[PDB]
Design a protein around this nucleic acid. Structure first.
Ligand code: MG
Ligand code: MG
Ligand code: MG
Ligand code: MG
Ligand code: MG
Ligand code: MG
Ligand code: MG
Ligand code: MG
Ligand code: MG
Ligand code: MG
Ligand code: MG
Ligand code: MG
Ligand code: MG
Ligand code: MG
Ligand code: MG
Ligand code: MG
Ligand code: MG
Ligand code: MG
Ligand code: MG
Ligand code: MG
Ligand code: MG
Ligand code: MG
Ligand code: MG
Ligand code: MG
Ligand code: MG
Ligand code: MG
Ligand code: MG
Ligand code: MG
Ligand code: MG
Ligand code: MG
Ligand code: MG
Ligand code: MG
Ligand code: MG
Ligand code: MG
Ligand code: MG
Ligand code: MG
Ligand code: MG
Ligand code: MG
Ligand code: MG
Ligand code: MG
Ligand code: MG
Ligand code: MG
Ligand code: MG
Ligand code: MG
Ligand code: MG
Ligand code: MG
Ligand code: MG
Ligand code: MG
Ligand code: MG
Ligand code: MG
Ligand code: MG
Ligand code: MG
Ligand code: MG
Ligand code: MG
Ligand code: MG
Ligand code: MG
Ligand code: MG
Ligand code: MG
Ligand code: MG
Ligand code: MG
Ligand code: MG
Ligand code: MG
Ligand code: MG
Ligand code: MG
Ligand code: MG
Ligand code: MG
Ligand code: MG
Ligand code: MG
Ligand code: MG
Ligand code: MG
Ligand code: MG
Ligand code: MG
Ligand code: MG
Ligand code: MG
Ligand code: MG
Ligand code: MG
Ligand code: MG
Ligand code: MG
Ligand code: MG
Ligand code: MG
Ligand code: MG
Ligand code: MG
Ligand code: MG
Ligand code: MG
Ligand code: MG
Ligand code: MG
Ligand code: MG
Ligand code: MG
Ligand code: MG
Ligand code: MG
Ligand code: MG
Ligand code: MG
Ligand code: MG
Ligand code: MG
Ligand code: MG
Ligand code: MG
Ligand code: MG
Ligand code: MG
Ligand code: MG
Ligand code: MG
Ligand code: MG
Ligand code: MG
Ligand code: MG
Ligand code: MG
Ligand code: MG
Ligand code: MG
Ligand code: MG
Ligand code: MG
Ligand code: MG
Ligand code: MG
Ligand code: MG
Ligand code: MG
Ligand code: MG
Ligand code: MG
Ligand code: MG
Ligand code: MG
Ligand code: MG
Ligand code: MG
Ligand code: MG
Ligand code: MG
Ligand code: MG
Ligand code: MG
Ligand code: MG
Ligand code: MG
Ligand code: MG
Ligand code: MG
Ligand code: MG
Ligand code: MG
Ligand code: MG
Ligand code: MG
Ligand code: MG
Ligand code: MG
Ligand code: MG
Ligand code: MG
Ligand code: MG
Ligand code: MG
Ligand code: MG
Ligand code: MG
Ligand code: MG
Ligand code: MG
Ligand code: MG
Ligand code: MG
Ligand code: MG
Ligand code: MG
Ligand code: MG
Ligand code: MG
Ligand code: MG
Ligand code: MG
Ligand code: MG
Ligand code: MG
Ligand code: MG
Ligand code: MG
Ligand code: MG
Ligand code: MG
Ligand code: MG
Ligand code: MG
Ligand code: MG
Ligand code: MG
Ligand code: MG
Ligand code: MG
Ligand code: MG
Ligand code: MG
Ligand code: MG
Ligand code: MG
Ligand code: MG
Ligand code: MG
Ligand code: MG
Ligand code: MG
Ligand code: MG
Ligand code: MG
Ligand code: MG
Ligand code: MG
Ligand code: MG
Ligand code: MG
Ligand code: MG
Ligand code: MG
Ligand code: MG
Ligand code: MG
Ligand code: MG
Ligand code: MG
Ligand code: MG
Ligand code: MG
Ligand code: MG
Ligand code: MG
Ligand code: MG
Ligand code: MG
Ligand code: MG
Ligand code: MG
Ligand code: MG
Ligand code: MG
Ligand code: MG
Ligand code: MG
Ligand code: MG
Ligand code: MG
Ligand code: MG
Ligand code: MG
Ligand code: MG
Ligand code: MG
Ligand code: MG
Ligand code: MG
Ligand code: MG
Ligand code: MG
Ligand code: MG
Ligand code: MG
Ligand code: MG
Ligand code: MG
Ligand code: MG
Ligand code: MG
Ligand code: MG
Ligand code: MG
Ligand code: MG
Ligand code: MG
Ligand code: MG
Ligand code: MG
Ligand code: MG
Ligand code: MG
Ligand code: MG
Ligand code: MG
Ligand code: MG
Ligand code: MG
Ligand code: MG
Ligand code: MG
Ligand code: MG
Ligand code: MG
Ligand code: MG
Ligand code: MG
Ligand code: MG
Ligand code: MG
Ligand code: MG
Ligand code: MG
Ligand code: MG
Ligand code: MG
Ligand code: MG
Ligand code: MG
Ligand code: MG
Ligand code: MG
Ligand code: MG
Ligand code: MG
Ligand code: MG
Ligand code: MG
Ligand code: MG
Ligand code: MG
Ligand code: MG
Ligand code: MG
Ligand code: MG
Lengths: 88, 275
RNA sequence: CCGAGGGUAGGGCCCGUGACUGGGGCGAAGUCGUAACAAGGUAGCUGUACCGGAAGGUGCGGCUGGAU
RNA sequence: UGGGAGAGGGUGGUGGAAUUCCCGGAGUAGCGGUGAAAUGCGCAGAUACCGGGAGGAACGCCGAUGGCGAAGGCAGCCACCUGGUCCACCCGUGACGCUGAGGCGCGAAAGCGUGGGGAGCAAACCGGAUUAGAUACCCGGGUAGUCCACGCCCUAAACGAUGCGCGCUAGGUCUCUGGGUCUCCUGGGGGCCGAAGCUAACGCGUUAAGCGCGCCGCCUGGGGAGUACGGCCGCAAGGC
RNA sequence: AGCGCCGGCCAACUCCGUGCCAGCAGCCGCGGUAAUACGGAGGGCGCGAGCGUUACCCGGAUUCACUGGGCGUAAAGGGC
RNA sequence: GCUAGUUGGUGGGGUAAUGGCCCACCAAGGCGACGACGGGUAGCCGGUCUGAGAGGAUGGCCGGCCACAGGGGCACUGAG
RNA sequence: CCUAAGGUAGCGAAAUUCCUUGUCGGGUAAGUUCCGACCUGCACGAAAAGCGUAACGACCGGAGCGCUGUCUCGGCGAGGG
RNA sequence: CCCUCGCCAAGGAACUCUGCAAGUUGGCCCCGUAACUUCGGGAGAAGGGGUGCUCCCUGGGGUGAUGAGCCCCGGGGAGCCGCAGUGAACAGGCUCUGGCGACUGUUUACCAAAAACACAGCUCUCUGCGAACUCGUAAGAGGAGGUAUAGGGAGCGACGCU
RNA sequence: GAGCUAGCCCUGGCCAGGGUGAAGCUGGGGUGAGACCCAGUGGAGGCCCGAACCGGUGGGGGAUGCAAACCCCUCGGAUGA
């Protein structure tokens, strides 16, 4: 799984200010982390459809946040997806 | 995975070729090849004794090490995996730390860079050779000697394997690739794993020409011949067989068992093949 | 030059019709059985599959919209 | 951020019971099967009993009016990978929300392709019965298939015959799983019985079929017909 | 002065003839020897240089429902 | 799904006049689930008919506009 | 009644159909051939495989357009004899 | 009279077992192209336009050097002549529809090239290896320096549904 | 007797020119990642057209021949069994 440590580093790396958890950026980046692992997991467990749904739900969730953040502050979005290498 | 073709000629529509994925070195070891003397199916009297052979691609014989107990305890590195035209299996190049090089037939899963060894103490892992008596019952195994120090004789074809079923005295009991149950002596070497290139059987030759490249010349039906030639020969128009179906030499060919009756190894065969 | 249209050739859509053929509706004064409705006399229905003169049957899985 | 329950999903291993077949032993006149029989099996030694072995498939008790999942569905045990979900803290974001024509994915069983595998079961099929007849029901056999991998099919009484989300309108009792000041209270789930109210009735009733808003899908007499034609999908069967 | 109608819907009833025939008919339905339902007759009702039939439009049809319907079991929730 | 005078541009031709209305060149555009393209049907309106209304149906006569003049094409004359 | 069991799907006047130029339909002015059908299959039928099948064929049928000394129907000319 | 060859009025397959034979078509560039399909094809489908020479303007490449010369691939405009411009020579007639065989291949040297044989592919069967099988009295060989995903024999003959 | 012919074995040689344009690869698009679509590149094949070469389809001629199997026209294959 993801370790508290790995989560923190990400929580910390993306936070807008020291105590920040749950801002848009932190939210998107955490998802990106769970996304890229499941994605990897499914690459090997191609018949794990049940987890694939979750993936979709997350992919969905990250999308809405990105749509929000893009509406609210273009620069922040452009930077975020660029920080995480996201669009396609 | 076998490789398909788009149907851009009538023949490519069904032709499939091997993927050669495991292959890492495309030239044989110069000191391990010698010319194969092509026979055409002719014996030393010059007579065809096996019909319909001749005309295939030229081939160099790769010398294979079917003994292995030859170098007990000396490990080797798997240097490469190569194509061998003389067999269905691929062959693995071994660099012994001794500095001697040999070929073995390449087991499923052999990795280039890995190390193999032979002897009573060898780890029970893919690529190693031990006498059967030191191999855990249940393990699948290949290139098996049929009698001690006489060389690997069993399970050499692409994809094949034998499984150890039990032990009895000086002998272990194997399930052969045919499903025959047979006793083989405990002192006989076998190599752990199955033979690789297991997709070999899914190849579709695709055209007459490809059998031709394999040195397999056209085969003609007794039914298409005349009575001078064959039991099924002649008759006006097409004909059914008109007698029990027979070989060119007259022996019956649908069911007639042919194994010699009083044969000494009958004593060691527990159960004739399945299906 | 363009040009009504004419001519040559190949396409698309639609209507009529056709040896023969597939079922359908109806009629009813028939033949064969009795599948469903009662536990309907093998609970029924079901998607699928194989099979049978016929309703139908059986297998697999599902539903109760099943009597006791 | 702390925690929780669960047959949720995928992979790899792995345990015992039973059935079948084979081998060894011991034993003999029947066994099996039905409403009753017969076919069948059995002195070429069956059944029943002991020991050995082989192989596939399903996991008894626990087990529940239980649990998990969006549904289809999911059950021996172990590890790894992985989804959903609930609780407590009231720490962060600042309406970032609901639904969703198309599209995409998943989708019991049967079925299909290529390759495995095959103990038990069992369409088709053979035979015995039953019977007026018996292409059935019951009995003896039996091939696909049922099992695995990979790719297809895309249906269903795929049902709660009940689309999703939100808000509002008495309670009683049983239960699963949390957190409490653990008598008792407070969440989230599963049943029952009921207030108001609904409703053609039957029944529904904080798990609404009540009172309301949002969005989607669907209906408009029975048959003909889920048929025809066309189109799109499919290897086919066939699907929309 | 004519024409339709007189079972119910729908206002207007008896006699003969016929006997599941001949026939009526918009729907439901009448006729098988006592038919207010067929045909004639008497009588009655309705309109009147008109009366009735056929065709078609809207209405009744809140039966496409905006006004103003619905989907557990009636047709109707998409398999998720 | 449709489009090559197609969508825009520059220059010119033409007209009473704008305009791809016509041409030459240049650019690669224009349209479409808010339904293009295609098929079918219909001249449109004032009105008319019905209906409580909302709606439905309709466009005969009269008035307004359009279109046509055996089926097509064409220009001449002319304010037209 | 008989049999070991009585030909399934598909196909069928067929490279198989005797009667036969079967019958009906199509094409032609006219069609023993050809195509489509029907089915009383003399005497199809499932790996001496059954029924189909895009592409292929100096294979074997039938039709049309194009064009011609093939023909109506022959004439002239050339060169080698 | 025969052979090989050229032309032919009107007709145009009426010839004949049969368009046999001979005509027609004919290269290249451009436009355009149906059923059906295994999505490759069917396709050069079909059908049609262009094709010489002269002058003028102009685009790109190779070799040079980046330029000249030389050589290569074009584009646009205006003309000239003839019956006719791949002007001679070499160079598909096409379509529709059935049978058979899937297909490229093979064959009766010298009367049959096919529907015959072969063929990928499907199935049955034998074969545990000093294999089965074949040749040989034998030795020895083939099989195979292969080992059941292999080798022998037999039928069937891509593929689809069986 | 395999200097003909048939098969095989060893070793060499030959196959003008033109066309079609598989996989792959690169780039663009697409998606969560993908499948996949487009372009360019590429140069596959018992692929196409056609000489050499190998054949021998149909016709005509030849028929005490040029020839005990030839000639003319036509036609099949021509990187492959
Ligand atoms: Mg979420
Ligand atoms: Mg985005
Ligand atoms: Mg292929
Ligand atoms: Mg491919
Ligand atoms: Mg092809
Ligand atoms: Mg092909
Ligand atoms: Mg390989
Ligand atoms: Mg491989
Ligand atoms: Mg080499
Ligand atoms: Mg050397
Ligand atoms: Mg040397
Ligand atoms: Mg050798
Ligand atoms: Mg020798
Ligand atoms: Mg000799
Ligand atoms: Mg000799
Ligand atoms: Mg032989
Ligand atoms: Mg030979
Ligand atoms: Mg190899
Ligand atoms: Mg291979
Ligand atoms: Mg194969
Ligand atoms: Mg070879
Ligand atoms: Mg063979
Ligand atoms: Mg053969
Ligand atoms: Mg033959
Ligand atoms: Mg013969
Ligand atoms: Mg002989
Ligand atoms: Mg003899
Ligand atoms: Mg003989
Ligand atoms: Mg014979
Ligand atoms: Mg015979
Ligand atoms: Mg014969
Ligand atoms: Mg004969
Ligand atoms: Mg015969
Ligand atoms: Mg013969
Ligand atoms: Mg015979
Ligand atoms: Mg036979
Ligand atoms: Mg016989
Ligand atoms: Mg032995
Ligand atoms: Mg014109
Ligand atoms: Mg025209
Ligand atoms: Mg004219
Ligand atoms: Mg009819
Ligand atoms: Mg009929
Ligand atoms: Mg029943
Ligand atoms: Mg009944
Ligand atoms: Mg019943
Ligand atoms: Mg059923
Ligand atoms: Mg019957
Ligand atoms: Mg049955
Ligand atoms: Mg269910
Ligand atoms: Mg025993
Ligand atoms: Mg005895
Ligand atoms: Mg026992
Ligand atoms: Mg807060
Ligand atoms: Mg939603
Ligand atoms: Mg949808
Ligand atoms: Mg499914
Ligand atoms: Mg299944
Ligand atoms: Mg199945
Ligand atoms: Mg299967
Ligand atoms: Mg029976
Ligand atoms: Mg009986
Ligand atoms: Mg029975
Ligand atoms: Mg049974
Ligand atoms: Mg049984
Ligand atoms: Mg069995
Ligand atoms: Mg099967
Ligand atoms: Mg089947
Ligand atoms: Mg249910
Ligand atoms: Mg539910
Ligand atoms: Mg439903
Ligand atoms: Mg919905
Ligand atoms: Mg609703
Ligand atoms: Mg509680
Ligand atoms: Mg507690
Ligand atoms: Mg639940
Ligand atoms: Mg509750
Ligand atoms: Mg429950
Ligand atoms: Mg209740
Ligand atoms: Mg009440
Ligand atoms: Mg309650
Ligand atoms: Mg209700
Ligand atoms: Mg209806
Ligand atoms: Mg349908
Ligand atoms: Mg259906
Ligand atoms: Mg259809
Ligand atoms: Mg449906
Ligand atoms: Mg009246
Ligand atoms: Mg009235
Ligand atoms: Mg009254
Ligand atoms: Mg009378
Ligand atoms: Mg009377
Ligand atoms: Mg009346
Ligand atoms: Mg009366
Ligand atoms: Mg009223
Ligand atoms: Mg209305
Ligand atoms: Mg009405
Ligand atoms: Mg409403
Ligand atoms: Mg209603
Ligand atoms: Mg219903
Ligand atoms: Mg539902
Ligand atoms: Mg669906
Ligand atoms: Mg222009
Ligand atoms: Mg202008
Ligand atoms: Mg004017
Ligand atoms: Mg215009
Ligand atoms: Mg619009
Ligand atoms: Mg619309
Ligand atoms: Mg019109
Ligand atoms: Mg009109
Ligand atoms: Mg009204
Ligand atoms: Mg109108
Ligand atoms: Mg009118
Ligand atoms: Mg008017
Ligand atoms: Mg006009
Ligand atoms: Mg006019
Ligand atoms: Mg007129
Ligand atoms: Mg006129
Ligand atoms: Mg018998
Ligand atoms: Mg039968
Ligand atoms: Mg039949
Ligand atoms: Mg016939
Ligand atoms: Mg005939
Ligand atoms: Mg036939
Ligand atoms: Mg016959
Ligand atoms: Mg005949
Ligand atoms: Mg005859
Ligand atoms: Mg006659
Ligand atoms: Mg006629
Ligand atoms: Mg005729
Ligand atoms: Mg005729
Ligand atoms: Mg003929
Ligand atoms: Mg003939
Ligand atoms: Mg003729
Ligand atoms: Mg015929
Ligand atoms: Mg007949
Ligand atoms: Mg036959
Ligand atoms: Mg026969
Ligand atoms: Mg058979
Ligand atoms: Mg035969
Ligand atoms: Mg035959
Ligand atoms: Mg047979
Ligand atoms: Mg055949
Ligand atoms: Mg056929
Ligand atoms: Mg065939
Ligand atoms: Mg064909
Ligand atoms: Mg051919
Ligand atoms: Mg051939
Ligand atoms: Mg041919
Ligand atoms: Mg002609
Ligand atoms: Mg002449
Ligand atoms: Mg002359
Ligand atoms: Mg002359
Ligand atoms: Mg002369
Ligand atoms: Mg002369
Ligand atoms: Mg002439
Ligand atoms: Mg002329
Ligand atoms: Mg003509
Ligand atoms: Mg003509
Ligand atoms: Mg004639
Ligand atoms: Mg004649
Ligand atoms: Mg002919
Ligand atoms: Mg000819
Ligand atoms: Mg010519
Ligand atoms: Mg030419
Ligand atoms: Mg020619
Ligand atoms: Mg066509
Ligand atoms: Mg064709
Ligand atoms: Mg295509
Ligand atoms: Mg052309
Ligand atoms: Mg042309
Ligand atoms: Mg010119
Ligand atoms: Mg010139
Ligand atoms: Mg000139
Ligand atoms: Mg140079
Ligand atoms: Mg230069
Ligand atoms: Mg030309
Ligand atoms: Mg010349
Ligand atoms: Mg040509
Ligand atoms: Mg054709
Ligand atoms: Mg033909
Ligand atoms: Mg046929
Ligand atoms: Mg025929
Ligand atoms: Mg052929
Ligand atoms: Mg042939
Ligand atoms: Mg075929
Ligand atoms: Mg074939
Ligand atoms: Mg062939
Ligand atoms: Mg060819
Ligand atoms: Mg050929
Ligand atoms: Mg001969
Ligand atoms: Mg010959
Ligand atoms: Mg001769
Ligand atoms: Mg001869
Ligand atoms: Mg000859
Ligand atoms: Mg010949
Ligand atoms: Mg030929
Ligand atoms: Mg010949
Ligand atoms: Mg042959
Ligand atoms: Mg053949
Ligand atoms: Mg086959
Ligand atoms: Mg196979
Ligand atoms: Mg031997
Ligand atoms: Mg011998
Ligand atoms: Mg011998
Ligand atoms: Mg030897
Ligand atoms: Mg040997
Ligand atoms: Mg050897
Ligand atoms: Mg071998
Ligand atoms: Mg054959
Ligand atoms: Mg053959
Ligand atoms: Mg097909
Ligand atoms: Mg020779
Ligand atoms: Mg020679
Ligand atoms: Mg060589
Ligand atoms: Mg060549
Ligand atoms: Mg070439
Ligand atoms: Mg070339
Ligand atoms: Mg390819
Ligand atoms: Mg590459
Ligand atoms: Mg790419
Ligand atoms: Mg490419
Ligand atoms: Mg190129
Ligand atoms: Mg090429
Ligand atoms: Mg070729
Ligand atoms: Mg070619
Ligand atoms: Mg030449
Ligand atoms: Mg040369
Ligand atoms: Mg030669
Ligand atoms: Mg030859
Ligand atoms: Mg010739
Ligand atoms: Mg000729
Ligand atoms: Mg000749
Ligand atoms: Mg001749
Ligand atoms: Mg002659
Ligand atoms: Mg001669
Ligand atoms: Mg010649
Ligand atoms: Mg030629
Ligand atoms: Mg040639
Ligand atoms: Mg050719
Ligand atoms: Mg060839
Ligand atoms: Mg060629
Ligand atoms: Mg070629
Ligand atoms: Mg070739
Ligand atoms: Mg070669």
């Amino acid at each position: 799984p993801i370790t508290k440590e790995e989560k923190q580093k990400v929580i910390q790396e993306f936070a807008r200010f020291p105590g920040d958890t749950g801002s848009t950026e932190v939210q998107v980046a955490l998802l990106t982390l769970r996304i890229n692992r499941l994605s990897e997991h499914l690459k090997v467990h191609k018949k794990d459809h049940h987890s694939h749904r979750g993936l979709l739900m997350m992919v969905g969730q990250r999308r809405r946040l990105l749509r929000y953040l893009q509406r609210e502050d273009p620069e922040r979005y452009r930077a975020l997806i660029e920080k995480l290498g996201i669009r396609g | 995975a076998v490789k398909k073709f788009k149907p851009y000629t009538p023949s490519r529509r069904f032709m499939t070729v091997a993927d050669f994925s495991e292959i890492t070195k495309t030239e044989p070891e110069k000191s391990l090849v010698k010319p194969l003397k092509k026979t055409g199916g002719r014996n030393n009297q010059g007579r065809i004794t096996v019909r319909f052979r001749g005309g295939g691609h030229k081939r160099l014989y790769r010398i294979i090490d079917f003994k292995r107990w030859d170098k007990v305890g000396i490990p080797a590195k798997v240097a490469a995996i190569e194509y061998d035209p003389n067999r269905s299996a691929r062959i693995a190049l071994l660099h012994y730390v001794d500095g001697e090089k040999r070929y073995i037939i390449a087991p499923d899963g052999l990795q280039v860079g890995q190390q193999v060894v032979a002897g009573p103490d060898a780890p029970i892992q893919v690529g190693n050779a031990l006498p059967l008596r030191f191999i855990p019952v249940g393990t699948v195994v290949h290139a098996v000697e049929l009698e001690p120090k006489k060389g690997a004789k069993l399970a050499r074809a692409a994809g094949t394997s034998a499984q150890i079923q039990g032990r009895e005295g000086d002998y272990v009991i194997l399930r052969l690739p045919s499903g025959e149950l047979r006793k083989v002596h405990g002192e006989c070497y076998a190599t752990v794993g199955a033979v690789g290139n297991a997709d070999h059987k899914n190849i579709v030759l695709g055209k007459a020409g490809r059998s031709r490249w394999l040195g397999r010349r056209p085969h003609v039906r007794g039914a298409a011949m005349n009575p001078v030639d064959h039991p099924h020969g002649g008759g006006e128009g097409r004909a059914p067989r008109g007698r029990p179906p027979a070989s060119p030499w007259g022996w019956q060919t649908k069911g007639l068992k042919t194994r010699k009756r009083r044969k000494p190894s009958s004593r060691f065969i527990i159960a004739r093949r399945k299906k």
